[PDB]
């Protein structure tokens, strides 16, 4: 099926980890799995409903990292006066996405905050 | 030819308004000023320094955290990360109950120079830039 | 009997949520928590000290300016000065394009203790208070 | 009519003063008039339209004090949980109302900011 302690949904294996890490450390940890893996991604509502079923018993209700980082980075930024966005001067700031261990609702967080997370790989 | 209340810089006119507006209210306000201004664009170092000096000089201002300038994402998705960390692309999204940080502001604690993406529906003071007639 | 995420104090349970909500969104959220909570009331010195310690301990929080608590004016006019300085009472008002400061918040620069009236439609982190079942 | 330099509208006399004062200093200054007077009050749209006609030539477009102070003070404040508002702990903050020398739109300001103002008395 999936290695012990992991759970399969639709050809993929999932594991919750109740261990506050920042987004990079959490994605790191997933990459470090014996089968190399990533922070959970969601392709459907039903996959999200399955993942929260997993998070609930032990992780709920911590924030849990999902695999979306720098969510405000590559936006098509422009000037309202139409000037060319040539010169630039941004902070020094990154946001990442998370959900509560209990609902499917996403939450934008500073990437250096500390949440739980779920790893995912293809079986 | 700048009006009273406006400060000249480099052929443009600038004014920091202490009214607290949403980013959309602020831009609309600016358009209704003189021969039609906009939220400030920052197109150089010199101008960043100027706008920054302008704010730090406006006394009503205040103690105020954020000051809108004319930066807006366009966008087009409701978050800008095109791919998940597994290489797949984002099709389902659950952004219900989540506000977007798709408008740009200057920030008090970073000397009103560095740009901060921030929530558009937040009301703040703002700077207009105008090309006089 | 407090749940994980909630902190006990004096028979109540408290939790600071880092989601940024309008004062109305925040109160509604709180009502939808456990057996139905509210934005925190502060009813004493001890509790003010407690709530303040609670926030200053929430790491996501942040660097955050304001934190909603359950204070709302009721109101009933749209500004609360009943008379002009000449003794006459206010009948005509021009509050179009002006937002009201009729919701109460705790503030970072005053140690999350002193209450600040502030604009309700501003999104901020918030504290819920609950009486467990 | 009205003393020289003042203007009458509807039984009352008005004068603009282009001289940044805080709300108290401005209301003070009005009280100090030979005929004791107050910061302008508005009872109608037409009175507001008349006052901005006055402000425009010299004061526009400064903020101008009107006679409304502590505008957030005596509100019927309550707790959303219904607890008695017995214990209290407010700043240390006061707001006052102003308008631009060019429109009728009011603006809430810190009482210790510095604007122009208009005095008003009954003739
Ligand atoms: Cl663990
Ligand atoms: Cl980001
Ligand atoms: Cl004068
Ligand atoms: Cl006040
Ligand atoms: Na197993
Ligand atoms: Na399984
Ligand atoms: Na220069
Ligand atoms: Na794909
Ligand atoms: Na105690
Ligand atoms: Na009266
Ligand atoms: Na005269
Ligand atoms: Na006259």
From Swiss-Prot, chains A, D:
Q: Please give an example of a GO cellular component term from this record.
A: extracellular region
Disulfide connectivity?
A: 2-13, 30-119, 96-111
Assign the protein's first listed, main location to one coarse class: secreted
Localization per record: Secreted
Tissue specificity is:
Expressed by the venom gland.
- Name the Gene Ontology molecular function terms of this record: metal ion binding; toxin activity
- Subunit structure of this entry? Dimer (non-covalently linked) of heterodimers of subunits alpha and beta (disulfide-linked).
Query: What function does the entry list?
Result: Elicits platelet aggregation by the binding to the C-type lectin domain family 1 member B (CLEC1B/CLEC2). Binding leads to tyrosine phosphorylation in the cytoplasmic tail of CLEC1B, which promotes the binding of spleen tyrosine kinase (Syk), subsequent activation of PLCgamma2, and platelet activation and aggregation. Binding to GPIbalpha (GP1BA) and alpha2/beta-1 (ITGA2/ITGB1) may also induce aggregation, but this is controversial.
What is the protein's name according to its record? Snaclec rhodocytin subunit beta
Instruction: Give the organism, scientific name.
Output: Calloselasma rhodostoma
Q: Which residues of the full protein are shown?
A: 24 to 146 of 146
Swiss-Prot record, chains B, C:
Provide the disulphide bond pattern: 2-13, 30-128, 103-120
Q: Does the keyword Secreted apply?
A: yes
Where does the record place it? Secreted
Q: Which organism is it from?
A: Calloselasma rhodostoma
Name the protein family.
Belongs to the snaclec family.
Question: What SMART domains does the record tag this protein with?
Answer: CLECT
Q: Name one Pfam family in it.
A: Lectin_C
Expressed, tissue-wise, as follows: Expressed by the venom gland.
Where would I find the C-type lectin domain in this sequence?
A: 9-129
Gene Ontology biological process terms from the UniProt entry: regulation of cytokine activity
Q: Which InterPro entries match?
A: C-type_lectin-like, C-type_lectin-like/link_sf, C-type_lectin/snaclec_domain, C-type_lectin_CS, CTDL_fold
The record's listing under Gene3D superfamilies reads: Mannose-Binding Protein A, subunit A
Keyword tags = Disulfide bond, Hemostasis impairing toxin, Metal-binding, Platelet aggregation activating toxin, Secreted, Toxin
Q: What is its main location?
A: secreted
User: Is the keyword Disulfide bond in the record?
Assistant: yes
Its Gene Ontology cellular component terms are: extracellular region
Cited function: Elicits platelet aggregation by the binding to the C-type lectin domain family 1 member B (CLEC1B/CLEC2). Binding leads to tyrosine phosphorylation in the cytoplasmic tail of CLEC1B, which promotes the binding of spleen tyrosine kinase (Syk), subsequent activation of PLC-gamma-2, and platelet activation and aggregation. Binding to GPIbalpha (GP1BA) and alpha-2/beta-1 (ITGA2/ITGB1) may also induce aggregation, but this is controversial.
Q: Name one GO molecular function term.
A: metal ion binding
Record's subunit section:
Dimer (non-covalently linked) of heterodimers of subunits alpha and beta (disulfide-linked).
Protein name, entry field: Snaclec rhodocytin subunit alpha
């Amino acid at each position: 099926d999936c290695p012990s302690g992991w759970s399969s949904y639709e050809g993929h294996c999932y594991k919750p980890f109740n261990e506050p890490k920042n987004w990079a450390d959490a994605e790191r940890f997933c990459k470090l799995q014996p089968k190399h893996s990533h922070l959970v991604s969601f392709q459907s509502a039903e996959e999200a409903d399955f993942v929260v079923k997993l998070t609930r018993p032990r992780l709920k209700a911590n924030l849990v990292w999902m695999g979306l980082s720098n969510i405000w980075h590559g936006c098509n930024w422009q000037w309202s006066d139409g000037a060319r966005l040539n010169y630039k001067d941004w902070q020094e700031q990154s946001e990442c996405l998370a959900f509560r261990g209990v609902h499917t609702e996403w939450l934008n967080m500073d990437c250096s905050s500390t949440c739980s997370f779920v790893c995912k790989f293809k079986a | 030819d700048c009006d009273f209340g406006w400060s000249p810089y480099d052929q443009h006119c600038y004014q920091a308004f202490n009214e607290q507006k949403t980013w959309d209210e602020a831009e609309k306000f600016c358009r209704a000023q003189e021969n039609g201004a906009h939220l400030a664009s920052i197109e150089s170092n010199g101008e960043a320094d100027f706008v920054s000096w302008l704010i730090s000089q406006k006394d009503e201002l205040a103690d105020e955290d954020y000051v809108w300038i004319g930066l807006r994402a366009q966008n087009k998705e409701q978050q800008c990360s095109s791919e998940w960390s597994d290489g797949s692309s984002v099709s389902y999204e659950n952004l219900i109950d989540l506000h977007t940080k798709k408008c740009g502001a200057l920030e008090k604690l970073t000397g009103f120079r560095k740009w901060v993406n921030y929530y558009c529906e937040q009301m703040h003071a703002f700077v207009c830039k105008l090309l006089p007639y």
